Amino acid sequence: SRRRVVITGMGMLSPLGLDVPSSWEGILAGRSGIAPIEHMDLSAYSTRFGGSVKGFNVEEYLSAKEARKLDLFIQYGLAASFQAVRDSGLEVTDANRERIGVSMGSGIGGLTNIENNCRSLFEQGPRRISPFFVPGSIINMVSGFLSIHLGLQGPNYALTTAQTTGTHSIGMAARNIAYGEADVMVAGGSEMAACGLGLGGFGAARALSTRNDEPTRASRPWDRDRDGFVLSDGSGALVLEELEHARARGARIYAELVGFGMSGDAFHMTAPPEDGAGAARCMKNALRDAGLDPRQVDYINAHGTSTPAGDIAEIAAVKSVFGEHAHALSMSSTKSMTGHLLGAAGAVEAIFSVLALRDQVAPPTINLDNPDEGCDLDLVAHEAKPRKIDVALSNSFGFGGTNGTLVFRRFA
Amino acid sequence: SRRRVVITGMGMLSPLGLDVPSSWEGILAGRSGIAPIEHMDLSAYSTRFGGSVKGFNVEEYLSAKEARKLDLFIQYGLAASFQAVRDSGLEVTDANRERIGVSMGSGIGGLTNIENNCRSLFEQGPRRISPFFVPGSIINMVSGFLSIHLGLQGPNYALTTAQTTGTHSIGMAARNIAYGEADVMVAGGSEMAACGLGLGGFGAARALSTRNDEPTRASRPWDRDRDGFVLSDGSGALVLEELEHARARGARIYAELVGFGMSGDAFHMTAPPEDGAGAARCMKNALRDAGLDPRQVDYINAHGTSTPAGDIAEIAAVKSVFGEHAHALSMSSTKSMTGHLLGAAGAVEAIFSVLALRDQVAPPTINLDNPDEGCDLDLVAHEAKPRKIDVALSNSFGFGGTNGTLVFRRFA
Numbered sequence: 077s078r079r080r081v082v083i084t085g086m087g088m089l090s091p092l093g094l095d096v097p098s099s100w101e102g103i104l105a106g107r108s109g110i111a112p113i114e115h116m117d118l119s120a121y122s123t124r125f126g127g128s129v130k131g132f133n134v135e136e137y138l139s140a141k142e143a144r145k146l147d148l149f150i151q152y153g154l155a156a157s158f159q160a161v162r163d164s165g166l167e168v169t170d171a172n173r174e175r176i177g178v179s180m181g182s183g184i185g186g187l188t189n190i191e192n193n194c195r196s197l198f199e200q201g202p203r204r205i206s207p208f209f210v211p212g213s214i215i216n217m218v219s220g221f222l223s224i225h226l227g228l229q230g231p232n233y234a235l236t237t238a239q240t241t242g243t244h245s246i247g248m249a250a251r252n253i254a255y256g257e258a259d260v261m262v263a264g265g266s267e268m269a270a271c272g273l274g275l276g277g278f279g280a281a282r283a284l285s286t287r288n289d290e291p292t293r294a295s296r297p298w299d300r301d302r303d304g305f306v307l308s309d310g311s312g313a314l315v316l317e318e319l320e321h322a323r324a325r326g327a328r329i330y331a332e333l334v335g336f337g338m339s340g341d342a343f344h345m346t347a348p349p350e351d352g353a354g355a356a357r358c359m360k361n362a363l364r365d366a367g368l369d370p371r372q373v374d375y376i377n378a379h380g381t382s383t384p385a386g387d388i389a390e391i392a393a394v395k396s397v398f399g400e401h402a403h404a405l406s407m408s409s410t411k412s413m414t415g416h417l418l419g420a421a422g423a424v425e426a427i428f429s430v431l432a433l434r435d436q437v438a439p440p441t442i443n444l445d446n447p448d449e450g451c452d453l454d455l456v457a458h459e460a461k462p463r464k465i466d467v468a469l470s471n472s473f474g475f476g477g478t479n480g481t482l483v484f485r486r487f488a
Numbered sequence: 489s490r491r492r493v494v495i496t497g498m499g500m501l502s503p504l505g506l507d508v509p510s511s512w513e514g515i516l517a518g519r520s521g522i523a524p525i526e527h528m529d530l531s532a533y534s535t536r537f538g539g540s541v542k543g544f545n546v547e548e549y550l551s552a553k554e555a556r557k558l559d560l561f562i563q564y565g566l567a568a569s570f571q572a573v574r575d576s577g578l579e580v581t582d583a584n585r586e587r588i589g590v591s592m593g594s595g596i597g598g599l600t601n602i603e604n605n606c607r608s609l610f611e612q613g614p615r616r617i618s619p620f621f622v623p624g625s626i627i628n629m630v631s632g633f634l635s636i637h638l639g640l641q642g643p644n645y646a647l648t649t650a651q652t653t654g655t656h657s658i659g660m661a662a663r664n665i666a667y668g669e670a671d672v673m674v675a676g677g678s679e680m681a682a683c684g685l686g687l688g689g690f691g692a693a694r695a696l697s698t699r700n701d702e703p704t705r706a707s708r709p710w711d712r713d714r715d716g717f718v719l720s721d722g723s724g725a726l727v728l729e730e731l732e733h734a735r736a737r738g739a740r741i742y743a744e745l746v747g748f749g750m751s752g753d754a755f756h757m758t759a760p761p762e763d764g765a766g767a768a769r770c771m772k773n774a775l776r777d778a779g780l781d782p783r784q785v786d787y788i789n790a791h792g793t794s795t796p797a798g799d800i801a802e803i804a805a806v807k808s809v810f811g812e813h814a815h816a817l818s819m820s821s822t823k824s825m826t827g828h829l830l831g832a833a834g835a836v837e838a839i840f841s842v843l844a845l846r847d848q849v850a851p852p853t854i855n856l857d858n859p860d861e862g863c864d865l866d867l868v869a870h871e872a873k874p875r876k877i878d879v880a881l882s883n884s885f886g887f888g889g890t891n892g893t894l895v896f897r898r899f900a
């Protein structure tokens with residue numbers, strides 16, 4: 077048998093806001109976080125816009141000296157994690173610290189730091205590389221620094237599954253709790269790939285929208301005029317907690333995490349199969365894990381990247397899984413507003429899925445002006461849709477054909 | 489309820505050989521894989537040697553056309569994975585492809601490729617960044633490319649827990665199988681961090697041995713004249729398989745994986761605590777997971793990095809976990825010969841632990857001329873020791889205070 081897992085704390089940096097409530101207010105208002113990138117010369121570049129975190133103050137969390145040791149993606153992960161642990165009210169003690177762990181991941185990790193240290197290395201040789209280069213750049217240092225700061229002695233690890241990172245991180249943390257390896261996990265992801273290497277790297281693969289004239293219309297999932305994803309920065313963290321542990325301390329419980337699915341497409345390094353076969357197996361795995369019939373799903377937070385092939389595969393996968401229920405559920409891409417946070421996408425989208433349950437509202441797919449061929453589902457075009465939501469899925473489908481699905485349910 | 493997990497295939501690249509048997513021959517002969525680095529000019533660096541893979545032929549696995557797109561850590565992880573799958577005799581079918589997954593990790597991932605593309609960017613502009621920059625560099629693409637080449641549709645993910653990565657990857661892949669998420673997993677790690685930023689960044693932290701004039705003696709775990717770790721490259725992969733699934737197909741079983749432990753030190757970003765308290769918590773977790781009396785432990789493949797603080801903390805943790813039995817077991821560091829393969833360390837050392845069980849021999853700790861204060865256990869100094877081994881333990885410790893332990897035992 078298996079223990080139940082609930083969400084008792086959430087934390088976020090996104091292009092819409094420096095916490096969950098500010099971000100969620102923007103999501104329900106259909107506001108875009110996408111703008112031309114600043115203090116960084118994107119002249120030789122075909123994409124000059126994205127989703128930046130605006131006005132982040134790391135000294136609310138860390139001393140300036142400790143912050144100087146850490147890449148932005150680690151700072152962002154620690155901010156979301158500290159927010160989530162505060163939001164949970166949990167008190168870490170000698171009696172429970174071995175039962176509290178961390179799984180915060182990243183898809184690309186410390187590109188800004190690597191870039192800045194390449195500058196030193198090429199211009200002056202190795203003796204100018206920062207002594208903190210390695211520990212301040214490696215993906216597991218959000219989990220590492222958080223564990224050291226809060227005294228967490230539970231399972232300590234980090235996933236890196238590209239654009240699926242946040243989803244897998246939360247799912248595998250839920251497994252730790254369900255199977256009794258921890259009572260509490262801080263789980264999610266962070267990303268800051270807006271450097272020459274990130275915009276250049278995706279740009280060289282012609283993966284990005286080049287809609288420089290209208291950055292806020294660039295992210296348009298399922299719209300016939302879409303032309304690739306929008307690169308975005310930030311972090312999401314959830315406090316996952318065993319149910320009896322949450323009830324014993326009088327925790328506020330947002331939602332229950334009832335299902336986790338994983339699959340591999342085994343198809344292509346970057347492109348999904350046209351029919352979304354692996355995304356369909358992953359959703360069916362998640363529903364089987366939750367003991368739920370596809371008919372019980374009310375809301376899907378899509379991967380919805382605004383790539384031609386990705387968006388159409390997800391429609392095919394939902395029609396395949398849900399059959400005569402596929403039009404009854406609501407499915408929206410919050411990437412229409414946030415852009416694509418890569419490894420943090422799944423983390424912030426799990427939070428939006430939990431808030432859809434709390435507030436009984438499907439967030440919009442903004443910019444869905446002209447649905448493409450076959451995109452005839454309820455994709456919540458333009459404006460938020462109050463409706464009944466008992467069961468909410470969050471999907472992530474990333475490079476290497478790696479898929480994740482989380483199933484959340486209302487808790488009462 | 490929890491299923492049993494066996495090892496049916498292994499694969500490797502190490503500084504000692506281009507497969508498992510060649511690597512193991514070097515281990516049992518006390519041979520060093522450490523030499524001055526040839527693939528780049530290190531005259532400006534404080535460390536100029538390491539454990540390189542010698543004579544690797546990517547072409548016996550992949551087309552040279554596909555290899556050109558992939559960082560060496562990915563090529564290395566694929567090589568070990570292909571070897572392990574072949575060694576298992578498993579045939580991928582429509583009947584089983586959804587039940588076979590992959591978890592191959594890395595501590596740093598594609599630092600060579602990122603460095604080379606950063607050089608292109610700075611010297612020539614963003615239009616010279618490779619279109620394959622992202623999928624040829626990011627850590628999850630061993631799991632991704634392996635799934636594409638072999639048709640594996642099961643759980644597809646990757647860990648990144650610094651020097652613990654290979655141990656965590658194997659342990660968590662075993663849990664997938666134990667809990668019914670998969671019947672087979674290919675799991676381990678790969679690393680090729682021998683680039684300017686790698687040698688420069690560990691050099692900046694003064695973490696590396698600077699014994700440039702005698703590289704084969706640099707790696708000297710528990711020796712009083714040790715002065716840091718030796719950076720090494722390669723990969724280890726194991727095929728983990730549910731017991732009844734292995735028995736059902738007449739698989740050759742090398743050993744059973746009975747125990748997995750994780751803990752966080754919550755102490756320091758890079759330094760282990762001198763008393764080895766997190767390591768001790770991790771080993772106790774693993775021994776309890778395996779249902780063992782600690783006196784059953786015959787052999788420990790130590791982390792044994794050849795750092796002053798790390799090596800002594802391991803002695804303290806083993807004495808704390810095993811009490812008087814600490815004097816009866818044998819403990820060695822094969823990093824004495826291979827150097828430190830970082831995220832691959834736990835993967836090649838899991839293989840060495842399984843081969844210790846197969847051959848009933850404790851591999852030597854070479855270079856242990858003068859054991860330091862309190863380093864008075866059986867550390868198998870200089871020469872391989874034939875002995876009874878029913879139970880073998882492999883430990884890993886990493887940045888962020890992240891600990892892993894695997895417990896293997898003979899299968900009858």
Ligand SMILES: NC(=O)C1CCN(CCc2ccccc2)CC1
Pocket residue numbers: 506507510548549570571574
């Ligand atoms: N000692 C050597 O040089 C060995 C190294 C391993 N090779 C490759 C074997 C292989 C190829 C494809 C798939 C699985 C395995 C054979 C030669």
